[PDB]
Assembly symmetry: C4
Homo-oligomer: 342 residues x 4
């Protein structure tokens, strides 16, 4: 039983600027989610019953990303949801699958609805059940694109790619609503997890998704510079108008419900919590700020594409003092900024 | 010889366990552990020997759940014997008794032995001392088969010296306790994760187990202590609010509290300078409900690490260090929690 | 994509005392801003529309420093502001230029008004547009002093010096109103940025400016010890009577507006700064006095009669968060105002 | 410019327990302040106008420690305070001296009043003025015990010893009222400073004093285990009945005034201390009882029956801020007062 190293999250690191011949308006955000699936922007919405149904997925895809329909619903309803996204323009769409008895039955129905990718998502992706589930899926549907998660190690990338996954999803414990690391003691701070896993995926030719723990646009730049093909978010999108759930008002402020899929409410021992986040308005305005920040970061790094970003990215580690310097400090902020908050 | 800085030492909140390949489900794992070579526990949990934590009611409840309680010694010799006696006659449950380094030490041990106590815990502020080492030797001479836990310690050298004195198990923890001020008033101690790991390593070489005593707040902390090599975890704070702990239920402004205090606090010693504090913690209802959450957390952690057994968990556990920013990410963040979780509190 | 090292900001480090044969009242604060421009004190006011117009630049220069007139104005008005400064005595003045379609005509205007230095300043100075800008300016006005920024790597120092910069300005992300590091993920903790850049500039013969993130006089000492020729500040000066903006009273205290140049309000669409209020400080002279006294104190502690000697002989140690807590006052209820400390 | 290392303060480290054969009550706390001055306990009260006059110095002496009479009075009044302590019986007394034009005058007076040790104390002890001052005092009074400070490096230990000091005082910037590190940028976290200076002093046979930054009895154990012959405290004693100043009441709480001597108030150029108020803590003997109890407890944990053995067998580990949270009480609503713990 040994200590391997210090592992870092997004707030621990910064990207060093490079020489740049490209302006933020000239960079391309295109990325391959699998070898067969290109996104126009590297963003995905979490498959949670408070984040992504057909309305969110349609909106994500029109912006050039993708939404993964959650599976806290009957098989027929999830099929319906996928079908509505597919009929709204041949937009891309995903569907969540669990390691369950009816797993193949749920897969058959979202395939019938012509889902583009299934996400075999589970608390612990580096497990025999997930490995065998991927092998059953790829044996019946060899061309069906499969994302498997969640994981946090190069060995997990290796075993899941060996099983036939086309993409793997990284993140054990970083979610805003997640208590996995506290109740089970397990996880890897997300920037080191993505860096280590994406480096392994690149050697195998399998992309990785940086899933969870993202709070600012600059976090996504770091996830992409570390080598993730795409970034998945629940918190950043669950307050948008297109997220499921009504808008609630409490003492002058408008909120939407957001909860972990492993919380008591979502399941009705838990590994998530349930709560409220601020109402953000329409997805478009959030995406515009996220993409603007990504384009700026890429301008700072001289990267015209996502791959060039990864190839020339150098991180430095900052201390808690450096974190205090990186945020605004020693000012009473009195005007809303659209891409910042405390 | 000169003073030196050895290394950085870590507490539970500093580290995370890296997930392994798993072929085991949380409900398939076994929590059986050897507290000593002759005492098996069904779950690796112990309740602390404090006068706000463990008497008969608590020890009975702990044994029923598969753990064990250590009856505290802020008690006449006779009362402690009767406390042990009630646990033994309550269905043959395991029971332990706390013993200090006192002039009547052997008279206290005699009485709990007669009450058929299964283990005695010679616990004191500084276990790595001549008084403790001579006391273990005296007990193992009069009672060669009596199981003896000695503590508290924090170094591998202390494991060896107490193992050579004849201890069957050593208890690790100088300063991690919720109510403890040792490190602040005396400047002494070792962050608990590193203390458990370095002592467990030495104990494994010698074949003596180590207990991780103090500083546990969440079920995931227990997983880290077991993964660092402890055979069992000892908790005061987590159990002091349970209905089975001593003390009445106090209500102040809509919340329910129970008293919890260090054995080295002024109040506990009136019943020197103090090395503990006195206060209140939340009432938690029945012990069974807390243990359920603890065991569930432990089983989930073993599932993530691919460990069907506690020895497999130690053999394959890998830790990473996280910063304070990583700690912020590990807890729920950027959310207004509006519903209680039964295993997470703020 | 890899991790280079840990990088430090000012609060991460402390300077070790040296043997001293000099009293703080004997040190000299002269610095070469460029080869041609000497300042009597190594302080600059930021080129921001809530910090430096002519009033601020005139006071900074009378105190021995310099102000950089911001460019959130028409070309004509910026020339008029520089001209106000030059007509108010022998006063040094600077003017901010950006990478814009009308860049050279803005430079022509400020040159005609007799500006002493232009600051070609933009979010990312290590860029082809800044490099081409410096070359174009130097090709037309070979003797005009050019500061280029902002940057944070030794490679950018070398490229901007090769382009013909006379001085480079270091700082990506540290400013009190800046969100660059949060929104784009990019920056270098400022003490390490200044140290690594100044060392490259020393080898090349080009000075560097420590711009941004400075809060106390001690911070400036650390910036200068790390090799910067001068320190540039916005927050420390924006609350002064000579900065732009009225004085606002609210619940018994006095405030002034301070905002990033990349905030929505300054720009009037993804901002890299915020907008807010800071305490009114009174006259520039009194803040400068405290700054100077603290710098002179630090040079006393390090035995430095000059700023070059301070840099040549300074050693740092890293402190933890607990060391930070010990470095500030602690375990006291402060009941009297200190003119050079506040919580 | 170069970063030498990470430097640590008391909150950054913990001492590893040793095998012990000694109970706390059996421990001996005697120490050599200098080769010719023994204290029954290794505690000194700071030479500050809010901590030690004769009332404090006499009380420190009766407890086994010693007070340094502060210098913020006339030469005549300081000798009177020294004389009053020395006529109260066989009590030890120190007196503070500065690098002043009347330095020798003030030394003459306190020497006439039979002071036992002088403390040539200044902001920056590793300076020509202090080195010359020690040399002049020792050339006139070869047997006067001289403590010189304040310093933070082994080079300063060596330079001050070669000048004739009998003890050196370590501490640049750790004091609770101190702002040296914020306003001048200079200092060394105190545990590292004591350890590095104590190691040099032991090679030379000259003791060091750990001055400032101590909050709990456990911090003093760390400073002695790090090599100091004694610990000097202002904040821990300024709330005691024997400190100067009246007991002031506000909302049912009792306070005393405490201020740095580089604060504006004490100086009545640029300040390096703050002014404020701390809790009233009653008679000094109550506080000393708790300090000595905690020290004896720590030496029990370290198997040190006496103090010389302590440094030789002291092993520190570094703790993170998470370890710091574990070291204090946590997850408890403390409802009873503890005599040796507060937050
Ligand atoms: C996103 C989160 C956190 C999550 C989402 C929904 C529910 C949960 C709950 C609260 C139910 N918690 C677990 O489910 N915890 C868990 C822990 C360890 C293991 Cl080993 C495990 O099972 C693995 O093996 C199975 C077969 O491959 C497959 O279920 C896989 O997860 C599950 C967590
Ligand atoms: C002080 C700050 C932060 C600042 C000040 C004013 C405005 C901005 C705004 C909000 C407009 N943000 C950027 O402007 N962000 C940005 C990011 C990356 C690049 Cl690559 C970039 O462009 C570089 O290339 C161009 C040609 O050299 C030149 O404009 C140069 O800055 C600009 C920031
Ligand atoms: C859980 C805690 C902290 C604790 C629990 C109850 C009481 C105490 C008190 C406040 C009384 N504090 C000590 O007791 N402090 C102490 C410190 C150093 C030594 Cl060396 C020491 O004595 C050792 O040597 C003796 C013979 O082996 C034996 O008493 C052993 O403890 C005791 C602490
Ligand atoms: C405890 C503190 C902080 C302290 C105590 C009282 C007064 C001061 C004031 C506020 C006046 N601040 C300094 O005095 N600051 C200072 C800074 C650098 C140097 Cl180099 C210096 O003077 C050195 O050179 C002289 C010749 O020996 C000698 O006086 C020595 O101190 C003094 C500080
Ligand atoms: O309750 C749960 N426990 C742990 N992780 C969860 C839970 N529910 C969702 N997640 C993960 O957390 C991510 C959202 O993280 P966020 O973007 O920080 O809010 C999802 O994409 C899932 O990977
Ligand atoms: O007063 C004391 N001072 C220091 N440690 C104590 C004191 N009383 C009990 N302990 C220890 O603290 C443990 C409880 O830690 P907790 O589970 O963090 O509350 C006990 O099992 C003892 O090992
Ligand atoms: O909005 C902006 N975003 C990022 N940096 C800015 C912005 N506006 C001004 N700056 C920089 O911040 C410095 C002021 O930093 P301060 O002294 O910490 O307030 C200026 O000199 C500029 O270098
Ligand atoms: O104002 C000052 N500036 C810096 N240090 C001071 C000042 N006044 C007193 N000191 C130091 O601080 C010590 C007191 O530290 P305290 O015990 O932390 O309050 C004194 O013994 C002096 O060494
Ligand atoms: K900033
Ligand atoms: K989390
Ligand atoms: K201080």
């Amino acid at each position: 039983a040994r200590i391997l190293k210090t592992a870092y999250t997004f707030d621990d690191v910064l990207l060093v600027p490079n020489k740049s011949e490209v302006l933020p308006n000239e960079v391309s955000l295109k990325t391959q989610l699998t070898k067969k699936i290109q996104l126009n922007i590297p963003l995905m919405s979490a498959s949670m019953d408070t984040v992504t149904e057909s309305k969110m997925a349609i909106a994500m895809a029109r912006e050039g990303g993708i939404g993964i329909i959650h599976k806290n619903m009957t098989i027929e309803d999830q099929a319906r949801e996928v079908d509505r996204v597919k009929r709204s323009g041949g937009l891309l769409c995903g569907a969540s699958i669990g390691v369950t008895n009816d797993m193949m039955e749920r897969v058959d129905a979202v395939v019938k609805a012509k889902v583009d990718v299934i996400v075999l998502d589970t608390a612990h992706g580096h497990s025999k059940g997930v490995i065998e589930g991927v092998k059953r899926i790829k044996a019946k549907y060899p061309e069906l694109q499969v994302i498997a998660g969640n994981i946090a190690t190069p060995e997990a990338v290796r075993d899941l790619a060996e099983a036939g996954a086309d993409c793997v999803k990284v993140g054990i414990g970083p979610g805003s609503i997640c208590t996995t690391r506290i109740v089970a003691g397990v996880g890897v701070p997300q920037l080191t997890a993505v860096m280590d896993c994406a480096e392994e995926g690149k050697k195998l030719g399998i992309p990785v998704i940086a899933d969870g723990g993202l709070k600012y646009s600059g976090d996504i730049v770091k996830a992409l510079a570390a080598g993730a093909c795409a970034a998945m978010m629940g918190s950043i999108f669950a307050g948008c108008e297109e997220a499921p759930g009504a808008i609630e008002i409490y003492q002058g402020r408008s909120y939407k419900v957001y909860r972990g899929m492993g919380s008591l409410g979502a399941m009705a021992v838990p590994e998530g919590v349930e709560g409220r986040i601020a109402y953000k308005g329409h997805l478009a305005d959030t995406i515009y700020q996220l993409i603007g920040g990504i384009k700026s970061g890429m301008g700072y790094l001289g990267a015209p594409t996502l791959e060039n970003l990864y190839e020339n990215a150098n991180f430095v580690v900052q201390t808690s003092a450096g974190f205090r310097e990186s945020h605004p400090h020693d000012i009473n902020i009195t005007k809303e900024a659209p891409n910042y908050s405390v």
